[PDB]
Subunit: 331 residues, 3 copies
């Protein structure tokens, strides 16, 4: 068809593959969820996706992994969390200029880290995002004259937690909110639409995302996290990603692998508090760092169990296809 | 014999191999030293050892390096320094629950890091410990409602050092205290029993440990460290480990290698102050990080000298056996 | 000739190869520029160069890459920035003792990091320097009794920038100052003499250095950097190094590679602000860290463009010779 229609198929496929899902329709649903959260954040993220995909075209990289949207998904998040962490409010059009420049570095980091991780056959998860956003937010900070960021400071007092003033239904609502906060959205409807976007692609990814969000939610009640942060889903968006990555995407899904995914989600949830407290000294927020660290430290695990199998990256599409391919290869 | 007696032989061998020594009797002496320091810390560390060893059994890892106690030694330290850095006092039984969960990640990190370090034939020293304890302490911190940790803040004033109020004998007593503080104990008798535990295994390791402790002690007098921290052996427990690792364990011991071990101990002692000051901003203590960094940066050194030999990890037992094997191989 | 004359040829060649240039005359000019900035800093850096080169002799390393001055250039900078960041003023001869000891670790780190980077054919740029100086400054800090360092604290207020009180000519003078601040000098004459030292070696390196300094200077006006820091060339010395490294040294110089060098200089300039703000919490200054990170992340980039060529490290001398060798190899 027309080249502009291919480019947008690419940006659509690159929009949804933050969830490790590759469908234009899922990307459409995710963008629609972005516009119901905040129209400014949605356009900021779409512009980041466009620039990140176009930079890969400029750098003359492989055509195959631009159609999947691999270079796309690291720009939508950059735009989204540059719009989230600004103090100039909505529709501050001067924020688009740093998005233009700083999203062009996502393909560069994706190509640099893929040369290091090629000797262990590990996927590059979001490290271009984490590096890029940490760089931008530390370079500008809260006291910048042009692009100030929200004030984020460490804790210096004992939280006052009341266990007789916790409400179960809102706590259960953190499961949709926790999955919708991977992109930065805290509206339960956005999380729900994200759930349908996952389900139409592959139900098993949706199940693993939901259980990861729950596991992250209950892993913050064990260390007395303030309720107003669990209700906003800030304690369970790394766990969702970790569970999705470990469950059936990069490991052939079995009940042992399911338990391993639960363990990885718990480990990512506990690492999230540590990376939120340590990076709070710099004034920086934890941004998908715990997911990357936990996923890479669980994908590097070795085991003599014949039923915990690490799939080669050249043949990873989605968990049901992974099962079909594995069973075909065994026979 | 009975399987329960094998398991405990393993936990015994995994208790003492923090010192790179593999003997049930040395582990018995070390545990006895733990009980004379603090009975609560001793049981906390023994429980961590048991859980860390059992997790390796669950993860179906190699039998050979569970008998040596490789997966054991990263749990005793986790338990010990979780009990050391708590504000709830002795016999706070609710602290055992985080020890159960967080010690189960030591085998995972040991297997993940061994896949990265297998391409350079480098041992995994304590990085599972360092990562795990840093994670836990940063996740909970001093202001947690459930497991608060001791307050550790950086310096903001000039120490008042009086050189006419320094006592030589207590300064010399920092050599046993400095070696006993590798596990966390500050009782000179614990350090002494640790010395006998080393000596009965191999005298050369004991000699290198003692000289490393001395080198770390005198490397803090060169940068005007407060006396009350040298007297507690906090400035010479990384140096002890570095000297033990470099002297005759992973390098065939010669006088050139002995000097290299002295240099590594000095470098680790100076890195200890840096990692204590930088990690003090987070509220975290330096925990064997300087040892890991110095040992890995000295084991990666290359040299045309034919008498500085790096032993393969598959044939590293203890320095005298290393000499015997090297001389046999040359002939 | 006489051995002492070879040693000094080596220290001369190791003095100038911070700029990736290998000439005794360029080293002479650089040392002369050091003595016009500050005679104390110059002798401090020369002593560091001598000790770093001599340590490589002690460690019995390869003769070929000691003649080039590879082990030399990491000591001059250590001495220079140990003299820059002291509070005891000029001619504090007790500062030479830490320079003696701490410069002996540059060969060790250079040999350790070259074993890690040998599997990706990446040069070790200044990481021994960065690690060593960060170690020393964090170990001593501002409140040390023996070697206190200058007070460096993060920002907590909105800078008051007046755009009607900016002067163009002094802003243009930041190009020589910005290149002279790679070594630590802020005198425009030192930067000029550095420019002639580059030009006599290879004009293209001088051109890339100048354009990198300009790019770093104008990359700080985009995020509202205070004028008194751009005027001192603190915002463009990482960019100069990054541009020199990427332009024609490690990549065969073409217009596409020239644009890539501009992009790398811009990325290093923006990373400089981030590493200055984050490392300011520790009380540490950014010291060539942004250059190392940007150069390594741009040298690990892969591309299907046939005219962006990464040269093997065994055949990298200087850009014009690189062009000649590449054209000869193609024919």
């Amino acid at each position: 068809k027309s080249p502009v229609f291919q480019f947008f198929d690419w940006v659509l496929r690159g929009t949804s593959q933050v969830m490790f899902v590759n469908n234009p329709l899922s990307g459409i649903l995710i963008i629609l969820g972005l516009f119901i959260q905040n129209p400014w954040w949605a356009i900021s993220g779409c512009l980041g996706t466009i620039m990140s995909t176009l930079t890969a075209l400029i750098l003359s990289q492989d055509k195959s992994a631009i159609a999947a949207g691999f270079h796309g998904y690291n720009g939508v998040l950059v735009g989204l969390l540059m719009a989230v962490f600004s103090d100039k409010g909505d529709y501050y059009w001067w924020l688009l200029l740093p998005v233009i420049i700083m999203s062009m570095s996502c393909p560069i980091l994706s190509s640099a880290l893929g040369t290091i991780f090629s000797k262990w056959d590990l996927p590059v998860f979001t490290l271009p995002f984490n590096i890029t956003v940490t760089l931008y937010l530390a370079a500008t900070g809260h006291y910048n004259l042009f692009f100030p960021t929200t004030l984020l400071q460490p804790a210096s007092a004992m939280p006052n937690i009341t266990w007789s003033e916790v409400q179960v239904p809102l706590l259960l609502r953190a499961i949709p909110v926790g999955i919708g906060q991977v992109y930065g959205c805290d509206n339960p409807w956005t999380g729900g639409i994200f759930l349908i976007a996952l389900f139409i692609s592959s139900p098993l990814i949706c199940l693993h995302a939901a259980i990861g969000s729950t596991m992250g939610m209950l892993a913050a009640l064990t260390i007395a996290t303030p309720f107003d942060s669990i209700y906003f889903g800030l304690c369970g968006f790394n766990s969702t990603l970790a569970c999705i990555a470990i469950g059936g995407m990069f490991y052939v899904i079995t009940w042992q692998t399911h338990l391993l995914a639960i363990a990885c989600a718990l480990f990512a949830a506990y690492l999230g508090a540590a990376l939120a407290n340590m990076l709070s000294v710099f004034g920086l927020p934890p941004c998908t760092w715990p997911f990357c660290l936990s996923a890479l430290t669980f994908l590097l695990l070795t085991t003599n169990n014949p039923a915990i199998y690490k799939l080669p990256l050249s043949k990873v599409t989605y968990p049901e296809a992974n099962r079909i391919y594995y069973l075909s290869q065994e026979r």
